[model samples]
Every structure is written in C-alpha cells, then in structure tokens.
Target: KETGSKELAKVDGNVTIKDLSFAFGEHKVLSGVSVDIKAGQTVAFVGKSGSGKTTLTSIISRFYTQHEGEILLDGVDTRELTLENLRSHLSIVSQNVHLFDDTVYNNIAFGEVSEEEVIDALKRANAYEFVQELSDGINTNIGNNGSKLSGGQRQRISIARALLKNAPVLIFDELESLTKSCTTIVIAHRLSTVENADKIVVMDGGRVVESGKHQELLEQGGLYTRLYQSGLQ
Candidate 1:
C-alpha cells in the first residue's frame, strides 16, 4: 500500500541516513555511513576520488534503489513514497550539465513560466548579463548540449534551471550560492568551495572519518586537514 498515492507529501527538508551501505557487484562503494541534516541547513561532502561523496548524494536523490540501510526525508521512509513525489522536492545541479537543443528560454523554463520569473531565476544564477547579450536574448537557440555556449555558461544555465525549480531540497555536485531557507547538500572535490558550509563531512574509503565546521576540522588535523593541505600544494 501507499504506492502511487497522488497526494504530494510536504517535505520539511530534513534528511536522515542510517547505516547506509552500497556496492556494485563485487566492488563495495559505501559502507555503514550515517548522517542527519536538519531543515534549512547546508552540508558539504568532501573527499578524495571514489570516496563515496557523489554516491551518497545520488542515493539521497533516489538514483540507485539497491542499498543496505534506510534513507528518510522529514522522518518518512523514502522507499514508501512515490518516486515522483520524493523527487519533486529535490533540485539537482551536477557538474555535467545537460542542455537540450532548444531556445534558452525553453530550456530554463522547461514549461510555461512568467517572463519576470524567468529573468529573476537567471539573475539569481548570475547568468542574466550574458543571457541578455545573446543574439536573441532569452530566445536564442543554444544548440545541442549547449554547443553554442562555453562550459561555464552551460553550468550557469543549469544553475538557473535549478533555481527556477525552487525545490525544498537542493543537491549540488559543485559549489553554488544557495538560499538559507532551503536544505542544501553539496558534493565538492575542492575544499575551498565548501569551506563556508554549515557542516563539512569528510569521507574516506566510503566512511565518514570526520565532520565539523571548516576551522574545527582543520584544527583537529585529521583527514580533512590533510586534504586541505594537499589542495594548497
């Protein structure tokens, strides 16, 4: 029961992960990781390559269903919720941005939206100036996968799209300005990008070895400290 329920559940943006573990066939990727994020807070995940940073976020986004352990949103088990209802509250901006072969306006709007809202979203993502300079402004055709635009430009578009979505939970693979009213989760390789996060989780070999504020983690002189030092080198 409770599957395919049309009722859109309201999410408070709180997230809880308990003893989560995942593996791909014989390759174990995540192991016994647990984290709790309150509403309206920002948490950043930082670690070396294949440390399960992105995988954690992916699991939260429900990209991978096969895992050992439980994930809860606002105290409700995500497995019990409809996938569409669960994902409706999330907005994700990954490093690999995808753009359709269409006008910039359509790509950002994704559907009908007021012009003011579109412009506001673009401005919030810091893409308004460049967008206005385009040949047809927001109406300019961006070509396949945004071939007409630069990488940074495409990333900004992706940001704008997420901003327009305005979901209660925002998951970012890279650093970006976020609203204080939303629950934000970020996966970043660059330490500096997540230095200002409310909480920083340091992952190593698929487990959280350290978690705290930036300065606090550095003062502890553990894995996070070593990673920070390596970034500067």
Candidate 2:
C-alpha cells in the first residue's frame, strides 16, 4: 500500500547532508562539508561569527543552493523536490522572532494554523503561562515583530511556530547567541527539552567540527566541551 502516508505524514527521522559547498560572489563559504543527522539528537554548533554554521543549515533547508553537493531530507535530495515539498518537512527558529501584526493566537497559528494547535505548540515551548498573563490571553496583539513581548518570549513564540508547522526537522540558527545569561540558560533548557529529535549537526569555521548529545559530547572532552566551558564565563 504505497498510499503517501510516509509522504504526507510526519517525516521525523534521519537526514543526510553530503559533499555540500557554497559560495557568494567569489568567496567560498563552505568547502567539502559533510554531516549525517539521525533522528532525535540535539547538536550544537559552536564558533565565532561568520563560521558558516547557519549557512550550512540553510542549504539543508534549501534556503541557499549549494553549488557542489547534495542535501537529502530523509534520503530525498532537496534539489529534486519542490520548494513546497522541501520546506514542508523543515522548520526553523532563528534568533529573531518575526510575528505578523495580528493577535497572539493568529501569530502562533500563522493564519492556516488552528488555535488548539497553536496553544499546544505554545505549551510545548513553555510559553503558556506568559501568554495567558496577557490581557486577552492568546488573542492579544503582539504587534509587528512581536513588539509586545520580550526577546526570550518572542523566541519561545518562534519555537511554537516551528512546532505548529509540524515539520520533522527543526533548525535553530545562532539562537544560542543571546547574551543574557538567564535567557541563554532558558533557551538551552528548552532545546534539551525536545524529546525525540532525529539528528544534531554542529558546524564551525565552515565545517562540521563536532556533534553529539548533551552528555555524550561532554564526556568526549572535545571542542564542544571547551566551548561549553567558555560559555560559563
């Protein structure tokens, strides 16, 4: 029964990025980068700015085309899939949370999304209490760019958006770059809260330097360990 159940339903599983390379105007951004992301892992990318971590993930999401390699979202090459098809399987929560000039409910719903679903997503992101505190609750206006909320609150809303999108793959772009200690800690906690992720890919200096779970990488005493130590300062 090849009914498109696998095609239409959730694709929450393995993803492969191979021989990926990208450039802009004469400058090479990524070179010979390759990584495999299995289902249900939280991998963190650590490096100074301009390391191309976001750029590489962008290719996986098909935001930027890689001139010299293939990104497969569950064995299906993104180049071969339609934009709608590719994005349908991917969701991203970037550093800046962009909300429409609409009610909090609609902001999370993104119009086509349902109120019940949005509320569920908010709950998953730990945004329910604060959202409830608003005068209109979920129906409160967040204004353009979610101006009514704090950065962390907006970040949570962005996470809720991804959850509501119901995509199998979720990407957080430099989201850990927030400078506030409390906010950073909360974001880290929320990231660790995701239960069944497929793969976690860590990128640095235009290449995947290291990757693994919170404890696995910590035990390895590798690059991730050093960076985590540095983050404490």
Candidate 3:
C-alpha cells in the first residue's frame, strides 16, 4: 500500500559528520568525531575491536539516532529527512547477512524485479558463476539463512542485494563493484580490502587518530602504518 508520501530522488552521495558522539549508559562508544566524504569517493574505516568503526557507520544508517551529533547527506540534515527517504538513498551490506528459505531468485529480488536485472546483479556480485551450477539455477531453494551455501557465497548474495538496490551511497559494515564508481564507505577488518581506498581512517579508543590515502598513511608511520607493516610481516 502506497502511503502517498513523496519519494526522494537519488542524492549525490556526499556525507558529512560533525561532533558525533554516542554512548551506552556511561560507556562512551564514540567521541567528537567528524569526517567529510565526497560523492563517488571510496572511504575505508579501519580499527580494532570496540574502536567505534561500526558504531559510526551504524549512526550514518540511522541505526543509532539518540546520539549527539550531526549527519548530513548531500548537504541536507539526515534527521530532517524521512527514514524511508534516507534509506532509499543508501544500501548497506553487513558482515552477518540474513537470507530467506526460498529460491535464489526470490532472495535476490525479494519482490518484483526484472529477471535481467537480477541476473545482472548476480553477475556483478561474482555469484552468477556458481549459481549457474545449481540444479534449478536461480530457482534453487537456499534453505534457512542460506545454510546450504558457503560463507563467501552468502556474502556475495548480500553484495548482489546492495547492487540491486542501486543506491547512491553504499555502506559496507565489514563487507564491496559498481562500488568502484559509487560513493563507498567500508568498515573493513581485512586491511587488504581497503588498500586502494581514496581515504583511510584509523580509529582507536572511540576517536579518529589518523586519516589519509593508503600510501600517505603508511608514510606517516601512524597506527595504520604499523598495522599494515605487521600484516605484511
């Protein structure tokens, strides 16, 4: 049922955070963090566990709105926009992706979408090659939460879902084409995944400690440089 509310058009994907702070009771999760992400740029957030990387992304997705801060989307305050309007402009893929016990096609489409579009999304997500091998192809039942599929397979499906959404701003919480051309914000556990990011943000103890391009950060000999060196060695 349509609510008769106006649908928002696609945004330019620029994101701005100002004096962002969050807490659970007396335990502060984030403190006075700010960042500016331009449209079509790839930004990676790297940090240790409980360092507030995921918390920041979650705030941008409106998962935690009670926090004190300002989140702007394409120069507009996110709080001023309808939740539906804001979500329609962003696609989020998390580390733990959920799937239904239904056909692959249904899982990807979730509703009414063209077959060609589903196939395109699957192919772009690197899932089509294996999906083609299934007995019924896209019609094969995936079981509960995709229990029958491999971890990588499940992640790929989640990626396909984001690709199908085709939102201007893509948020990857511990997750990646069309991505290369979109405004991408990634919270990466694997440093290798973000080596080519336009900007790499290093966080620790609920604050942003360093931020720059991969090479630039490496040269700065900061936390990112140390982590990269340790990973390489």
Q: State which candidate has the highest lDDT.
A: 3
Candidate 2 lDDT, tens digit per residue, 1-233? Answer: 22122343456546676888899989888887887665644444555457676677667766677989787766767676666666677666765645788888887765286678778778888898899999998999988788888888887888787665655566665322211111110112233332222233345667777655656766788765665666611
TM-score of each: 0.85, 0.69, 0.83
Rank order (by lDDT, best first): 3, 1, 2
**Residue 231 error for model 1, in Å?**
2.7
Which tens-of-lDDT digit does each residue in 1-233 have in candidate 1?
54445434678799898899999888888999888999988888888888987778888867776468888888887877788788788877764556789988998887268878888888988888999999998999999888888877887887888877778898887624454568988786566666778888889899989898999988998888888888822
lDDT of 3 at 110: 71
Please provide, for model 3 over 65-148, each residue's C-alpha lDDT reduced to its tens digit, 9 standing for 90 to 100: 637779888988887777788887887776456689998899888727888888888898889998999899899998998987
CA lDDT of each candidate? 0.81, 0.63, 0.81
Model 2 TM-score relative to the real fold: 0.69
Q: Say which candidate scores most in TM-score.
A: 1
Question: lDDT of candidate 1?
Answer: 0.81
Candidate 2 regions exceeding 4 Å error are: 1-12, 111-117, 133-135, 147-150, 173-202, 210-222
Q: Stretches of candidate 1 above 4 Å error?
A: 1-6, 143-150, 175-177, 189-193
